[PDB]
Amino acid sequence: IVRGQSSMPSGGLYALIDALIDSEEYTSIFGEDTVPYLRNLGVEAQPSW
Amino acid sequence: MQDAITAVINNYDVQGKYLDGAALDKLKAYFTTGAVRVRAAAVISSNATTIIKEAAAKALIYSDLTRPGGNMYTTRRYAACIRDMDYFLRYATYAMLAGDPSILDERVLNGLKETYNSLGVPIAATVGGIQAMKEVVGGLVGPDAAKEASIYFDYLSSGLS
Amino acid sequence: MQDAITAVINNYDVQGKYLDGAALDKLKAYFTTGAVRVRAAAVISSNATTIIKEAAAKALIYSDLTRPGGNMYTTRRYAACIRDMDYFLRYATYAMLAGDPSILDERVLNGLKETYNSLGVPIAATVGGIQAMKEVVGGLVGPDAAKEASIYFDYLSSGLS
Amino acid sequence: MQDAITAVINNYDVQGKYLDGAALDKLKAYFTTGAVRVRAAAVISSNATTIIKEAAAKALIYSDLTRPGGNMYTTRRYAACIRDMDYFLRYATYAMLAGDPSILDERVLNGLKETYNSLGVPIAATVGGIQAMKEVVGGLVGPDAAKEASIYFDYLSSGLS
Amino acid sequence: MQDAITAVINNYDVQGKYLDGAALDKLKAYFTTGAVRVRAAAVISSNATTIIKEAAAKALIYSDLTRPGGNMYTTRRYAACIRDMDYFLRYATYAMLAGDPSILDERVLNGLKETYNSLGVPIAATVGGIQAMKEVVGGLVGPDAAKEASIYFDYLSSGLS
Amino acid sequence: MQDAITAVINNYDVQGKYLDGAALDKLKAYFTTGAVRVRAAAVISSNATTIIKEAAAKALIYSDLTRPGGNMYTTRRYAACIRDMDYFLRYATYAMLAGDPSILDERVLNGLKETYNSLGVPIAATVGGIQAMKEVVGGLVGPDAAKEASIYFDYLSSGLS
Amino acid sequence: SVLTKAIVNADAEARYLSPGELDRIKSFVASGERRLRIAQTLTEARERIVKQAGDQLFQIRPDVVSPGGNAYGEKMTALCLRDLDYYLRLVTYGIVAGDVTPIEEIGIIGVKEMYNSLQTPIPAVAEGVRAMKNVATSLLSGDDAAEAGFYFDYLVGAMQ
Amino acid sequence: SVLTKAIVNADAEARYLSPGELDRIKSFVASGERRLRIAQTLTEARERIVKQAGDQLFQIRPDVVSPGGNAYGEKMTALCLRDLDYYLRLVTYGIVAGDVTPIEEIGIIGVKEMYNSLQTPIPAVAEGVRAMKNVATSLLSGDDAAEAGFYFDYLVGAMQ
Amino acid sequence: SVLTKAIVNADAEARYLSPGELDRIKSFVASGERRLRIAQTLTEARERIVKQAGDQLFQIRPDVVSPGGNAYGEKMTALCLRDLDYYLRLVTYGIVAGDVTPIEEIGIIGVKEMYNSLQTPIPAVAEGVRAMKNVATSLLSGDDAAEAGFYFDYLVGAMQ
Amino acid sequence: SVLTKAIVNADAEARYLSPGELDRIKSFVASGERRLRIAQTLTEARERIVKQAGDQLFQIRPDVVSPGGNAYGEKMTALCLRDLDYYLRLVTYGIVAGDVTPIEEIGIIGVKEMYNSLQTPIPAVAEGVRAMKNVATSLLSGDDAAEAGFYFDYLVGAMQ
Amino acid sequence: GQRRIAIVAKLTENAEMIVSRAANRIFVGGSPMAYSERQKVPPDFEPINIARYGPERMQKSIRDLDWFLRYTTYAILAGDPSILEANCLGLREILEKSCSISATIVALLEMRKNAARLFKDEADSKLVSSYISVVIRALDADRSDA
Ligand SMILES: CCC1=C(C)/C(=C/C2=NC(=C\c3[nH]c(/C=C4\NC(=O)[C@H](C)[C@H]4CC)c(C)c3CCC(=O)O)/C(CCC(=O)O)=C2C)NC1=O
Ligand SMILES: CCC1=C(C)/C(=C/C2=NC(=C\c3[nH]c(/C=C4\NC(=O)[C@H](C)[C@H]4CC)c(C)c3CCC(=O)O)/C(CCC(=O)O)=C2C)NC1=O
């Protein structure tokens, strides 16, 4: 990326974290107010691959 | 995933070859069967639910499988089983449209054998559920499409056993 | 490997300590249960084959496991499975005599989970085969020894899961 | 996880049995000890910190373990160790309320032996930390509850060794 | 390994199915091409050495590969390379007789990609050596057998890339 | 990770020793080479792109690797490969500044050998890409720093083989 | 098959098939339709062969369906004939393959250890297997009955 | 292809192919025969297209074949036309599938990074592609020339 | 160290070190010999420093060494000075590293939980550290005494 | 132990333990209480046994504490008694287990190579052990003194 | 605890009666109860025991009644209805092609009433009706379900 404001922009670690968090999928299931939880066996349809 | 056509393109791309006569003949062999694949998919899709019901009736229910101690005992597990059946039917319809089984490996078979071993899901009984849906499908789609639909059900079932 | 007694000796050796009161109390707690361990081993050894037979009958056979598509289908694989069962029984009998599970790690569990994943061997089904042999063992050995035999079967089974 | 009331149901469900007289007797044997389990949990919870402190004092600190070269040297590792201790105490309190050790397997023992081998965490020393907390617990909870609390500490400690 | 006749049996055995109409049709599709496979194998076997010579001449030698710094420099390595070529030709002839590529996986491809990476053996150059032998083979065996021989050379070459 | 200085601190901390003469001598041996490490890093950083281009030109491209069938064929894979090269260069520059290879293990080598085996990435070819960047680096940084930069490139390359 | 057994020899010596090897594949495949007919006839009469085999067996050795017998009872008997059904199936496989590879991996390698564990009396089982030959052979022409008979006698041989 | 961009899209919502979605799977099928034919025609004249593209390129940008130019010299020019041969090939692939798909994975994703490393001037590669459009397009009927032209302009677009 | 801290920030943002980061490594390493001298002096007087901190502590808090005090008694006092010896050691480590990474992992992260368990009054441990600052600082030149003092005040800060 | 030895022989044969080796264990369990007691008694007088062993040794072999002797000097003698303390400890371990087992791994396998390097005269180490037997044996009842004596004579044997 | 086990005893002890009362009440034209392998609204438009159902259709319909009863005893021991709503939540659709949904409710209605005669309604007579209410409630609507 580069450093933009105070910095830590498109980081390595920093970029990865925004990318996750700003994803479509993230803000759908847990969008906005909920803390993330394991979507394991009981909760959703699990992939078998 | 890949279909008939991209199977050929990627096989030539790795050699960096323009498509030659042998390639062009393969692609023709796909295009020439294409209209029939479409008609067959429309029959399967629109009879989806009836195919599952007739396949379950011939190969799963009225049995120890649906009784206490059986893996499709409980409304929960009965629902999971016919849910699975719908996956198989639906994906086999994709494979047959694509004219390539690669999607059945990527999105259905990978890890499924062990997943079923881990839950206790009876493999042999599931294969019969696949080969019963094939039987029904082959009646509904007719001479034109019977053999072509059938193979991807057979792909599915030798993928588990 | 180590047993109760060498577990204590090596724990003190690394500190270069002569055995003290706490150590001596531990060793007593082993010696005082020793005669009972021996009697229990003689029951298991002499009923070995019957324990496997009754454990398989309650937890493995008469099932999809023994049918085509199942992992203990074929005389080859049925033989391999009850061969395994004999290992488990035999080593658990060693662990219980030693009063230490370390041998179950060194010579049985190490790499076994992945070995079973690589061959396709159903883990959950194998655990039931272990916990069925425990059930039989606990009847045969009696009040004296039941809890002590049982734990090393439980060690084995949480080692796979 | 499962508890005594739940285990009776799932143990019968797999046989498709109504609860019968033998089942009903087991459940009574749980209900009849229930009030005592609750009182014992309230003592443990409210003395949690003191139990860890007295258990560490009798079985861990003032030793080579807390000195340079020892696994509970550094404030980091001392904190991790008494953190662990709190887990054990807390879960044993769950197991004893449930009247079933299954939670100790599912959420505490599974993989823990090897986790400790991989980090270098001394197993024998951890068991003494468990059996010291049991000693303290058995004083605090009284005649009513002493034996029942004790067993799930003993379950924990033979799960590691 | 497996062949078309054998594969049909094991694919059905895992489902516990008698051979049925679909199975019997597959086996016919093999038997009906069988005599042609045999004739083709006798041409390849008896022209083995000439096929390698013409394939090397079109795709390997007269190049940097055979010059100092090249992987088929030294009589040692030149010998190893055309030795390999003979393996490929010979096994492809087995696969084509069997009408199944499974032997090419079990006894030729497994680990070979990494073996070549570890020695420095040029993969792309080896594929050209495979596809040149195919070219020669397809001339020698004629219309009857050309497509059927060709596929197992193509199996080999997409197995490396 | 650790550097020269924290390598010493942690080696003494586990013994609970204040730094003694031997320790103080080691740290001096680092500090006394420190200014030279900094200058060398500024040369590498500011010539990063040219080092990769000259290293690829001597050891990777103009070859079967970049041709169809080769692992750095396709703009995708060519990009991935020189991306990797930049990692190596950048981390080796970290290791050399720190005067400790521990970061090369923690953040680069761990699992990388098998990752490359799993994707098919040619190991020997990657090592040559490392030892070519070293060659270029040793020219650019001069007498002062040549040996010190070089060792962490050599650490990287014996970490893969 | 003949193919599996033979190609294996080719690959192991790093070579194409011999004239001999090619000849036997040709003679073998020519004998295909007949072998398929032999399997069909026997598949078509499987229930009869098993049942009549089972009567022939229990006369020649009944004790197995008696108080202290391994096959005593209705569901301990439902399993003994099922095993006889298994072996007839494997015999049809062998006949169409022209050798035992399949028969062997599926039902003789490990069979001593399996049956010793179950304490099914194995040697009674050989006689039971032999009875099926007698029934099956009475539904086949002389020439086809012999060709079938080799595979029955193999299983009888392997057991013991 | 058009298919890939399509069966995978009606599987991200777990459903069967929509009745309108099996119609893009219809135009393409009819188009494919014509599409296959155009690719074959392009393949036939490949050597002429590349060579004449290469002349058209070096007139328009003589700087790349000059002292400080990426393609300066006989073998720096040989590799340059080989790259032009690569892209024409990918253009035939794109046309036949009906969707660009594979060409992207084969020759644009990563292309900036590849050529930046080699120090190749990207925009003059885009010119080499325009030059190929001009030649190829003169060997095709008006209708087929347009259909081909979209794929040439895509590559020109992606190198940007 | 200063090195570890600079690098970790570099790697986490996927980049080479900044001019700033390079400058501080340079200034830091220039102070190497001086920092080593500061650690030596304090290592050389460790036994004296611990005792004078311990006297300063027990005057200011005679209660800790009183009936209901955590350090009441001869061996509850012996362990208390040993802890004071521990922290002086960590302070010498910090001074030669030029930051707290080592000091922190070894003796502040987890220290609240450790001492709460032992029921040690944390703020009087902070006083014991101030007492050591006072003694240690009287054995160092003005400039070196300040440089040392920052690390003492850090520990005092972290126990808070 | 006796347990380890019995089991290892059992497992090597891959069959459950016998009668004849499931006895010895019973004897050992009864013996172990007595065995544990003897070790405790030996542990109580360790300093006296070592010191008096050390006097008995240097009278019998004054050459080791002489100009060209391995144990010449106050330390070189201090380390020598420490080694005598090591072996007495291992002897208590051996007695308690009922089998020598761990002592072998701890202090005889490799002992020739260790002491040859240090240039220690092995046979005078064997004498130091006899000297300890004499002292230890005078603090035990006749029956317990013999049981202890076997383990002393083993070590004496292994240094040979 | 102790109640629930006693309450569950009673239901188990004379389980058949409760079932026979239902079985008899919807199946007219024979003895439904002979079939059950233990012995080994509108609402009715009474199925006949041999005419509309057959033997095999009848056995499924009889087992369910017995099986339906069994679940409440399991349900009773645990805190809730979870083992009943979950297996009945979409039961309507599996059953409707060959079972009259509304006919089946009357056997369930009957059972709840017939189950209660056993209790002296201290609290445990309320309970049995409460559990069996779930089967009925959660079954009908047939839009809300599944
Ligand atoms: C404990 C919660 C629970 C229930 C109740 C349950 C029922 C259930 N009923 C079934 C079928 C069936 N059930 C019935 C009949 C009836 N069912 C009734 O509850 C009525 C009393 C009667 C209609 C008046 C019939 C006729 C079939 C055959 C399916 C078909 O229509 O083909 C099946 C399919 C397998 C089978 O044939 O047994 C299940 C899984 N599963 C569960 O997990
Ligand atoms: C998109 C591709 C895909 C497939 C195919 C798939 C299968 C699949 N089947 C599952 C369970 C199951 N599958 C069945 C299937 C059956 N029961 C029987 O008795 C019959 C033999 C068989 C039906 C014919 C059952 C009963 C379960 C539930 C097991 C349990 O109770 O945990 C699960 C576990 C998670 C869940 O319960 O949903 C998966 C992932 N998942 C996928 O993502």
Ligand SMILES: CCC1=C(C)/C(=C/C2=NC(=C\c3[nH]c(/C=C4\NC(=O)[C@H](C)[C@H]4CC)c(C)c3CCC(=O)O)/C(CCC(=O)O)=C2C)NC1=O
């Ligand atoms: C001394 C300690 C030790 C153990 C425990 C051990 C286990 C072990 N089990 C194996 C295979 C196997 N293990 C089983 C086991 C089972 N099949 C089932 O379906 C059941 C769930 C289960 C029996 C309860 C089977 C069927 C195979 C054969 C897999 C194959 O066909 O390759 C193999 C592969 C080599 C072989 O086939 O013998 C090993 C090494 N090996 C050892 O050295």
Ligand SMILES: CCC1=C(C)/C(=C/C2=NC(=C\c3[nH]c(/C=C4\NC(=O)[C@H](C)[C@H]4CC)c(C)c3CCC(=O)O)/C(CCC(=O)O)=C2C)NC1=O
């Ligand atoms: C290097 C990181 C590190 C530190 C600092 C550390 C401290 C530490 N202090 C301890 C005890 C103690 N520490 C003190 C200290 C004090 N009493 C007071 O009132 C004063 C406030 C203070 C002296 C300034 C006392 C009195 C004990 C004994 C408490 C007891 O035994 O209950 C113990 C338990 C005894 C032992 O096993 O060593 C540890 C581990 N351990 C570590 O790994």
Ligand SMILES: CCC1=C(C)/C(=C/C2=NC(=C\c3[nH]c(/C=C4\NC(=O)[C@H](C)[C@H]4CC)c(C)c3CCC(=O)O)/C(CCC(=O)O)=C2C)NC1=O
């Ligand atoms: C919820 C169930 C659960 C448990 C029980 C659990 C244990 C556990 N203990 C750990 C480490 C540890 N555990 C200890 C424990 C001890 N040190 C000693 O010397 C004593 C013998 C013993 C305390 C009595 C120590 C010191 C570490 C740190 C090891 C390290 O430095 O990496 C870790 C590694 C991750 C971490 O450091 O937090 C886990 C996961 N994790 C879980 O999720």
Ligand SMILES: CCC1=C(C)/C(=C/C2=NC(=C\c3[nH]c(/C=C4\NC(=O)[C@H](C)[C@H]4CC)c(C)c3CCC(=O)O)/C(CCC(=O)O)=C2C)NC1=O
């Ligand atoms: C350093 C180890 C080494 C050797 C020796 C070597 C020899 C070698 N000799 C070759 C050809 C040849 N070599 C000869 C040699 C002879 N013709 C005769 O009749 C005489 C007996 C003999 C000359 C004394 C001939 C005639 C050819 C051409 C054969 C052909 O093209 O078919 C070739 C193939 C052409 C090429 O690509 O270079 C190689 C690799 N390669 C090596 O790496």
Ligand SMILES: CCC1=C(C)/C(=C/C2=NC(=C\c3[nH]c(/C=C4\NC(=O)[C@H](C)[C@H]4CC)c(C)c3CCC(=O)O)/C(CCC(=O)O)=C2C)NC1=O
């Ligand atoms: C199919 C996807 C694909 C492409 C396109 C590809 C291109 C490619 N172009 C290369 C070089 C080159 N490519 C060019 C091309 C040009 N010079 C110019 O000035 C013009 C702008 C342009 C011609 C239009 C030149 C001059 C080189 C040599 C550069 C060097 O050697 O430094 C190389 C390195 C040589 C080699 O090992 O092959 C690759 C891999 N590789 C691929 O896998």
Ligand SMILES: CCC1=C(C)/C(=C/C2=NC(=C\c3[nH]c(/C=C4\NC(=O)[C@H](C)[C@H]4CC)c(C)c3CCC(=O)O)/C(CCC(=O)O)=C2C)NC1=O
């Ligand atoms: C296809 C390869 C193959 C075979 C043959 C096979 C046989 C086999 N026979 C079995 C039992 C049995 N088999 C028999 C057979 C006999 N009793 C007698 O006395 C006679 C000698 C004989 C009949 C001719 C009996 C009586 C049992 C029941 C034994 C028991 O339950 O203890 C069982 C255990 C029950 C089960 O889970 O299925 C297996 C697996 N399994 C296989 O995978």
